[PDB]
PDB file of C-alpha atoms and ligand atoms in Angstrom:
ATOM      1  CA  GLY H 254       0.000   0.000   0.000  1.00 48.71           C
ATOM      2  CA  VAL H 255       0.472   3.809  -0.231  1.00 44.16           C
ATOM      3  CA  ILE H 256       2.165   3.891   3.167  1.00 44.29           C
ATOM      4  CA  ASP H 257       4.334   0.764   2.933  1.00 43.30           C
ATOM      5  CA  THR H 258       5.399   2.079  -0.479  1.00 41.86           C
ATOM      6  CA  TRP H 259       6.540   5.221   1.246  1.00 42.90           C
ATOM      7  CA  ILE H 260       8.228   3.516   4.267  1.00 42.76           C
ATOM      8  CA  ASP H 261       9.930   1.012   1.974  1.00 44.34           C
ATOM      9  CA  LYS H 262      10.808   3.902  -0.275  1.00 44.44           C
ATOM     10  CA  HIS H 263      12.060   5.712   2.851  1.00 45.26           C
ATOM     11  CA  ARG H 264      13.236   2.673   4.946  1.00 44.23           C
ATOM     12  CA  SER H 265      16.187   4.932   5.425  1.00 45.74           C
ATOM     13  CA  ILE H 266      15.388   7.619   8.001  1.00 46.12           C
ATOM     14  CA  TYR H 267      12.614   5.250   9.050  1.00 48.28           C
ATOM     15  CA  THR H 268      15.297   2.769  10.298  1.00 46.97           C
ATOM     16  CA  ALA H 269      17.288   5.757  11.702  1.00 47.84           C
ATOM     17  CA  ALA H 270      14.102   7.081  13.315  1.00 50.44           C
ATOM     18  CA  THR H 271      13.208   3.600  14.559  1.00 47.34           C
ATOM     19  CA  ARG H 272      16.179   2.502  16.755  1.00 47.29           C
ATOM     20  CA  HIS H 273      15.719   1.755  20.485  1.00 43.76           C
ATOM     21  CA  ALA H 274      14.517   4.769  22.412  1.00 42.94           C
ATOM     22  CA  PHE H 275      17.044   4.393  25.307  1.00 39.66           C
ATOM     23  CA  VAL H 276      19.773   1.860  25.868  1.00 37.64           C
ATOM     24  CA  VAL H 277      21.146   0.629  29.208  1.00 39.25           C
ATOM     25  CA  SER H 278      24.751  -0.056  30.233  1.00 37.95           C
ATOM     26  CA  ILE H 279      27.438  -0.872  32.705  1.00 37.82           C
ATOM     27  CA  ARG H 280      30.154   1.294  34.201  1.00 37.51           C
ATOM     28  CA  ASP H 281      32.315   0.958  37.321  1.00 36.66           C
ATOM     29  CA  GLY H 282      30.111  -2.053  37.911  1.00 36.70           C
ATOM     30  CA  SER H 283      26.827  -0.091  38.424  1.00 38.10           C
ATOM     31  CA  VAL H 284      23.837  -0.202  36.052  1.00 37.09           C
ATOM     32  CA  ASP H 285      24.016   3.081  34.049  1.00 40.34           C
ATOM     33  CA  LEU H 286      20.721   4.809  33.555  1.00 39.59           C
ATOM     34  CA  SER H 287      22.098   7.739  31.550  1.00 42.30           C
ATOM     35  CA  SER H 288      20.033   7.453  28.297  1.00 41.86           C
ATOM     36  CA  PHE H 289      17.021   5.958  30.004  1.00 38.42           C
ATOM     37  CA  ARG H 290      16.741   8.959  32.327  1.00 43.88           C
ATOM     38  CA  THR H 291      17.448  11.348  29.457  1.00 45.39           C
ATOM     39  CA  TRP H 292      14.694   9.705  27.354  1.00 46.37           C
ATOM     40  CA  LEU H 293      12.150   9.600  30.239  1.00 45.55           C
ATOM     41  CA  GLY H 294      12.551  13.286  30.811  1.00 45.54           C
ATOM     42  CA  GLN H 295      12.427  14.435  27.253  1.00 45.13           C
ATOM     43  CA  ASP H 296       9.654  11.972  26.330  1.00 43.19           C
ATOM     44  CA  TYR H 297       7.456  13.186  29.201  1.00 41.46           C
ATOM     45  CA  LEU H 298       7.494  16.882  28.117  1.00 42.23           C
ATOM     46  CA  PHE H 299       6.703  15.872  24.520  1.00 40.33           C
ATOM     47  CA  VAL H 300       3.852  13.551  25.571  1.00 40.84           C
ATOM     48  CA  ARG H 301       2.435  16.635  27.386  1.00 40.70           C
ATOM     49  CA  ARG H 302       2.589  18.442  24.017  1.00 41.94           C
ATOM     50  CA  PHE H 303       1.344  15.398  22.095  1.00 38.05           C
ATOM     51  CA  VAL H 304      -1.884  15.330  24.213  1.00 35.98           C
ATOM     52  CA  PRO H 305      -3.514  18.579  23.007  1.00 35.62           C
ATOM     53  CA  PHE H 306      -2.177  17.868  19.528  1.00 33.31           C
ATOM     54  CA  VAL H 307      -4.236  14.607  19.280  1.00 32.64           C
ATOM     55  CA  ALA H 308      -7.113  16.530  20.874  1.00 30.37           C
ATOM     56  CA  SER H 309      -7.127  18.581  17.743  1.00 30.43           C
ATOM     57  CA  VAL H 310      -7.125  15.437  15.615  1.00 29.11           C
ATOM     58  CA  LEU H 311     -10.138  14.042  17.515  1.00 27.92           C
ATOM     59  CA  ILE H 312     -12.023  17.286  16.829  1.00 29.89           C
ATOM     60  CA  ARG H 313     -11.160  16.895  13.099  1.00 31.70           C
ATOM     61  CA  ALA H 314     -12.169  13.261  12.686  1.00 30.38           C
ATOM     62  CA  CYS H 315     -15.562  14.318  14.078  1.00 27.95           C
ATOM     63  CA  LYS H 316     -15.963  16.948  11.347  1.00 25.58           C
ATOM     64  CA  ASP H 317     -13.886  15.506   8.448  1.00 26.78           C
ATOM     65  CA  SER H 318     -16.008  12.329   8.583  1.00 27.60           C
ATOM     66  CA  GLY H 319     -15.373   9.230   6.487  1.00 31.81           C
ATOM     67  CA  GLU H 320     -16.263   6.551   8.981  1.00 29.69           C
ATOM     68  CA  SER H 321     -18.091   6.695  12.295  1.00 28.21           C
ATOM     69  CA  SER H 322     -15.518   4.560  14.069  1.00 31.01           C
ATOM     70  CA  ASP H 323     -12.597   6.970  13.217  1.00 30.36           C
ATOM     71  CA  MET H 324     -13.241   9.093  16.244  1.00 27.51           C
ATOM     72  CA  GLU H 325     -13.115   5.957  18.401  1.00 27.28           C
ATOM     73  CA  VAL H 326      -9.915   4.903  16.773  1.00 30.34           C
ATOM     74  CA  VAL H 327      -8.464   8.232  17.797  1.00 30.39           C
ATOM     75  CA  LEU H 328     -10.426   8.592  21.031  1.00 29.39           C
ATOM     76  CA  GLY H 329      -8.797   5.487  22.449  1.00 29.53           C
ATOM     77  CA  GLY H 330      -5.272   6.605  21.529  1.00 29.09           C
ATOM     78  CA  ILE H 331      -5.763   9.842  23.403  1.00 29.90           C
ATOM     79  CA  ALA H 332      -7.414   7.738  26.110  1.00 31.35           C
ATOM     80  CA  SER H 333      -4.293   5.659  26.944  1.00 32.27           C
ATOM     81  CA  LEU H 334      -2.386   8.997  27.085  1.00 34.13           C
ATOM     82  CA  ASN H 335      -4.207   9.602  30.371  1.00 33.02           C
ATOM     83  CA  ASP H 336      -2.747   6.352  31.754  1.00 30.43           C
ATOM     84  CA  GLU H 337       0.511   6.772  29.869  1.00 30.32           C
ATOM     85  CA  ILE H 338       0.852  10.253  31.318  1.00 30.14           C
ATOM     86  CA  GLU H 339       0.039   8.747  34.739  1.00 29.69           C
ATOM     87  CA  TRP H 340       2.680   6.045  34.170  1.00 29.49           C
ATOM     88  CA  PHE H 341       5.329   8.766  33.467  1.00 27.16           C
ATOM     89  CA  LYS H 342       4.653  10.314  36.904  1.00 25.93           C
ATOM     90  CA  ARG H 343       5.199   6.939  38.693  1.00 26.44           C
ATOM     91  CA  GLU H 344       8.529   6.497  36.819  1.00 25.72           C
ATOM     92  CA  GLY H 345       9.621  10.003  37.612  1.00 27.94           C
ATOM     93  CA  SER H 346       9.246   9.167  41.219  1.00 27.22           C
ATOM     94  CA  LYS H 347      10.780   5.642  41.372  1.00 28.23           C
ATOM     95  CA  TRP H 348      13.743   6.737  39.255  1.00 28.08           C
ATOM     96  CA  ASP H 349      14.279  10.001  41.067  1.00 30.06           C
ATOM     97  CA  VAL H 350      13.681  12.085  37.872  1.00 27.76           C
ATOM     98  CA  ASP H 351      12.321  15.564  38.502  1.00 28.86           C
ATOM     99  CA  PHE H 352      10.099  16.613  35.644  1.00 29.09           C
ATOM    100  CA  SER H 353       9.766  20.158  36.961  1.00 27.88           C
ATOM    101  CA  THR H 354      13.534  20.306  36.617  1.00 26.25           C
ATOM    102  CA  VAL H 355      13.900  18.783  33.122  1.00 25.47           C
ATOM    103  CA  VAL H 356      15.220  21.141  30.430  1.00 28.40           C
ATOM    104  CA  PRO H 357      13.435  20.644  27.089  1.00 33.33           C
ATOM    105  CA  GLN H 358      16.153  20.284  24.469  1.00 33.51           C
ATOM    106  CA  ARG H 359      16.298  21.629  20.819  1.00 32.04           C
ATOM    107  CA  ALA H 360      15.086  18.432  19.128  1.00 34.13           C
ATOM    108  CA  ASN H 361      12.271  18.550  21.730  1.00 35.40           C
ATOM    109  CA  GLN H 362      11.344  22.254  21.870  1.00 38.65           C
ATOM    110  CA  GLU H 363      11.174  21.950  18.107  1.00 37.97           C
ATOM    111  CA  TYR H 364       8.659  19.082  18.203  1.00 37.23           C
ATOM    112  CA  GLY H 365       6.625  21.259  20.443  1.00 38.12           C
ATOM    113  CA  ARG H 366       6.376  23.730  17.568  1.00 38.90           C
ATOM    114  CA  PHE H 367       5.844  21.266  14.778  1.00 35.78           C
ATOM    115  CA  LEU H 368       2.895  19.506  16.501  1.00 36.94           C
ATOM    116  CA  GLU H 369       1.519  23.035  16.747  1.00 37.13           C
ATOM    117  CA  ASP H 370       1.685  23.393  12.978  1.00 38.19           C
ATOM    118  CA  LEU H 371      -0.764  20.517  12.873  1.00 36.98           C
ATOM    119  CA  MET H 372      -3.229  21.935  15.284  1.00 38.64           C
ATOM    120  CA  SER H 373      -4.467  24.576  12.795  1.00 37.43           C
ATOM    121  CA  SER H 374      -7.650  24.125  10.848  1.00 38.16           C
ATOM    122  CA  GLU H 375      -5.687  24.959   7.720  1.00 35.75           C
ATOM    123  CA  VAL H 376      -4.090  21.472   7.541  1.00 36.31           C
ATOM    124  CA  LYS H 377      -5.896  18.697   5.748  1.00 40.37           C
ATOM    125  CA  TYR H 378      -7.336  15.815   7.747  1.00 42.13           C
ATOM    126  CA  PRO H 379      -5.390  13.177   5.700  1.00 42.63           C
ATOM    127  CA  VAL H 380      -2.129  14.935   6.489  1.00 44.09           C
ATOM    128  CA  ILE H 381      -2.983  15.206  10.201  1.00 44.13           C
ATOM    129  CA  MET H 382      -3.955  11.530  10.397  1.00 45.50           C
ATOM    130  CA  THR H 383      -0.744  10.572   8.646  1.00 46.58           C
ATOM    131  CA  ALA H 384       1.297  12.396  11.313  1.00 44.85           C
ATOM    132  CA  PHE H 385      -0.817  10.930  14.168  1.00 44.11           C
ATOM    133  CA  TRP H 386      -0.282   7.525  12.641  1.00 44.46           C
ATOM    134  CA  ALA H 387       3.481   7.795  11.968  1.00 44.50           C
ATOM    135  CA  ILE H 388       4.125   9.017  15.461  1.00 43.66           C
ATOM    136  CA  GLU H 389       2.393   5.857  16.852  1.00 42.79           C
ATOM    137  CA  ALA H 390       4.007   3.434  14.467  1.00 40.42           C
ATOM    138  CA  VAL H 391       7.551   4.727  15.187  1.00 41.92           C
ATOM    139  CA  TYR H 392       7.258   4.161  18.914  1.00 41.23           C
ATOM    140  CA  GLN H 393       5.639   0.832  18.223  1.00 44.26           C
ATOM    141  CA  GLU H 394       8.438  -0.063  15.827  1.00 44.60           C
ATOM    142  CA  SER H 395      11.061   1.316  18.193  1.00 45.24           C
ATOM    143  CA  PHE H 396       9.632  -1.000  20.893  1.00 43.99           C
ATOM    144  CA  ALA H 397       8.905  -4.269  19.092  1.00 42.80           C
ATOM    145  CA  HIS H 398      10.835  -7.528  19.938  1.00 41.13           C
ATOM    146  CA  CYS H 399      12.120  -5.668  22.985  1.00 41.11           C
ATOM    147  CA  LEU H 400      10.810  -8.085  25.558  1.00 42.25           C
ATOM    148  CA  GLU H 401      12.425 -10.994  23.722  1.00 43.79           C
ATOM    149  CA  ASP H 402      15.754  -9.166  23.133  1.00 44.25           C
ATOM    150  CA  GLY H 403      15.341  -8.180  26.784  1.00 46.45           C
ATOM    151  CA  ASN H 404      16.723 -11.409  28.134  1.00 46.78           C
ATOM    152  CA  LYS H 405      19.825 -11.060  25.862  1.00 44.16           C
ATOM    153  CA  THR H 406      21.178  -8.173  27.914  1.00 42.92           C
ATOM    154  CA  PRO H 407      22.811  -8.065  31.438  1.00 43.19           C
ATOM    155  CA  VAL H 408      20.236  -5.892  33.179  1.00 46.19           C
ATOM    156  CA  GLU H 409      17.093  -5.110  31.320  1.00 45.22           C
ATOM    157  CA  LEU H 410      14.945  -2.131  32.144  1.00 43.50           C
ATOM    158  CA  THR H 411      11.446  -3.316  31.187  1.00 43.20           C
ATOM    159  CA  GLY H 412       8.893  -0.775  32.347  1.00 40.91           C
ATOM    160  CA  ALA H 413       8.626   1.045  28.989  1.00 43.17           C
ATOM    161  CA  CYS H 414       8.909  -1.929  26.670  1.00 40.70           C
ATOM    162  CA  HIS H 415       5.671  -3.143  28.354  1.00 41.94           C
ATOM    163  CA  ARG H 416       3.829   0.184  27.759  1.00 42.86           C
ATOM    164  CA  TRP H 417       4.623   0.488  24.056  1.00 41.90           C
ATOM    165  CA  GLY H 418       5.325  -3.193  23.359  1.00 44.41           C
ATOM    166  CA  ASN H 419       2.069  -4.884  24.389  1.00 44.46           C
ATOM    167  CA  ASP H 420      -0.371  -6.439  21.970  1.00 45.86           C
ATOM    168  CA  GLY H 421      -3.028  -3.856  22.766  1.00 46.53           C
ATOM    169  CA  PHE H 422      -0.908  -0.955  21.499  1.00 46.64           C
ATOM    170  CA  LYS H 423       0.110  -2.943  18.356  1.00 44.85           C
ATOM    171  CA  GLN H 424      -3.527  -3.249  17.254  1.00 46.00           C
ATOM    172  CA  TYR H 425      -4.329   0.238  18.450  1.00 43.27           C
ATOM    173  CA  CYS H 426      -1.603   1.703  16.252  1.00 40.91           C
ATOM    174  CA  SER H 427      -3.257  -0.539  13.762  1.00 38.17           C
ATOM    175  CA  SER H 428      -6.838   0.752  13.975  1.00 34.73           C
ATOM    176  CA  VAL H 429      -5.116   4.109  13.548  1.00 31.40           C
ATOM    177  CA  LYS H 430      -3.198   2.868  10.472  1.00 34.29           C
ATOM    178  CA  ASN H 431      -6.395   1.454   8.941  1.00 31.44           C
ATOM    179  CA  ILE H 432      -7.805   5.022   8.935  1.00 30.72           C
ATOM    180  CA  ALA H 433      -4.714   6.767   7.574  1.00 31.28           C
ATOM    181  CA  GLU H 434      -4.536   4.274   4.735  1.00 31.16           C
ATOM    182  CA  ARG H 435      -8.202   4.884   3.811  1.00 28.45           C
ATOM    183  CA  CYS H 436      -7.753   8.646   3.740  1.00 29.96           C
ATOM    184  CA  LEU H 437      -4.601   8.798   1.653  1.00 30.56           C
ATOM    185  CA  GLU H 438      -6.604   6.753  -0.776  1.00 29.09           C
ATOM    186  CA  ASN H 439      -8.518   9.813  -2.073  1.00 30.90           C
ATOM    187  CA  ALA H 440      -6.083  12.685  -1.529  1.00 30.17           C
ATOM    188  CA  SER H 441      -5.549  14.814  -4.681  1.00 27.92           C
ATOM    189  CA  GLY H 442      -2.036  15.555  -5.857  1.00 29.40           C
ATOM    190  CA  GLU H 443      -2.061  18.585  -3.623  1.00 28.79           C
ATOM    191  CA  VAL H 444      -2.895  16.825  -0.311  1.00 30.83           C
ATOM    192  CA  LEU H 445      -1.047  13.528  -0.923  1.00 30.95           C
ATOM    193  CA  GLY H 446       2.138  15.407  -1.654  1.00 28.71           C
ATOM    194  CA  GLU H 447       1.525  17.349   1.578  1.00 25.93           C
ATOM    195  CA  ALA H 448       1.241  14.024   3.434  1.00 24.98           C
ATOM    196  CA  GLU H 449       4.345  12.148   2.287  1.00 24.55           C
ATOM    197  CA  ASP H 450       6.380  15.233   3.095  1.00 26.81           C
ATOM    198  CA  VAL H 451       4.880  14.761   6.512  1.00 26.80           C
ATOM    199  CA  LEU H 452       5.534  10.986   6.943  1.00 25.79           C
ATOM    200  CA  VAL H 453       9.204  11.527   6.019  1.00 25.60           C
ATOM    201  CA  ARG H 454       9.023  14.596   8.224  1.00 29.10           C
ATOM    202  CA  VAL H 455       7.849  12.795  11.359  1.00 30.55           C
ATOM    203  CA  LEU H 456      10.846  10.443  10.877  1.00 31.01           C
ATOM    204  CA  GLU H 457      13.277  13.416  10.756  1.00 30.40           C
ATOM    205  CA  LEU H 458      12.165  14.645  14.181  1.00 30.96           C
ATOM    206  CA  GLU H 459      12.094  11.098  15.673  1.00 31.62           C
ATOM    207  CA  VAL H 460      15.781  10.765  14.575  1.00 35.45           C
ATOM    208  CA  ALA H 461      16.918  14.105  16.025  1.00 35.62           C
ATOM    209  CA  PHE H 462      14.888  13.287  19.225  1.00 36.97           C
ATOM    210  CA  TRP H 463      16.418   9.841  19.537  1.00 36.02           C
ATOM    211  CA  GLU H 464      19.934  11.379  19.507  1.00 37.17           C
ATOM    212  CA  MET H 465      19.361  13.353  22.674  1.00 37.06           C
ATOM    213  CA  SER H 466      19.547  10.176  24.726  1.00 37.63           C
ATOM    214  CA  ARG H 467      21.820   7.931  22.545  1.00 39.42           C
ATOM    215  CA  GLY H 468      24.054   5.321  24.283  1.00 38.41           C
TER     216      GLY H 468
HETATM  217  C1  HMH G 160       9.409  11.120  20.093  1.00 37.72           C
HETATM  218  C2  HMH G 160       8.207  10.245  20.408  1.00 37.72           C
HETATM  219  N1  HMH G 160       7.447   9.633  19.429  1.00 37.72           N
HETATM  220  C3  HMH G 160       6.348   8.844  19.793  1.00 37.72           C
HETATM  221  C4  HMH G 160       6.030   8.693  21.204  1.00 37.72           C
HETATM  222  C5  HMH G 160       4.909   7.888  21.823  1.00 37.72           C
HETATM  223  O1  HMH G 160       4.207   7.293  20.864  1.00 37.72           O
HETATM  224  C6  HMH G 160       6.833   9.332  22.110  1.00 37.72           C
HETATM  225  N2  HMH G 160       6.500   9.164  23.448  1.00 37.72           N
HETATM  226  N3  HMH G 160       7.905  10.091  21.691  1.00 37.72           N
END
């Protein structure tokens, strides 16, 4: 399909944009949580920005109707964000990470602004859904196999891998993909073009975000 054609056409930054969100390591014989804590912090401030973004996509699916179930595909996504956002607060506390004292970095402050460029009524629904999809898919792709490759490393940190690696999120990202795919399948030269620039564009930010915490 239209999307796989694009990912397989762009497997490139996609792969770059789809490498493990945080690694874990060993130094002076102590588990090193350097990337993990960097990722937790930066990913929490974005998630706070991602929330109203999706809000604006929910409002659009309700008025840029194609199917009745679209809003529920989106409504659930946003729904887990309540628990996901709650999960970030528990982690902040058990890992001694102070969110009020996190400094949003360039590749993050920037994502704050881009999501904003999607909140405007001027952007076409198919473009917006493509972004909302890609953003899911990348974290799903970044977190697949994790559990399994989790027992192939010294000390595994598993709390995240469970949140974005479970079978419920895989099929959620999927109900979301089913929509995107149905929309792009009608977009006229103007809008489609606008979309692919966006798929490849979500990957660019995921890559420059992923570098903040590299290990
Ligand atoms: C950068 C980034 N992309 C996607 C997600 C979650 O889907 C996240 N938490 N952060």
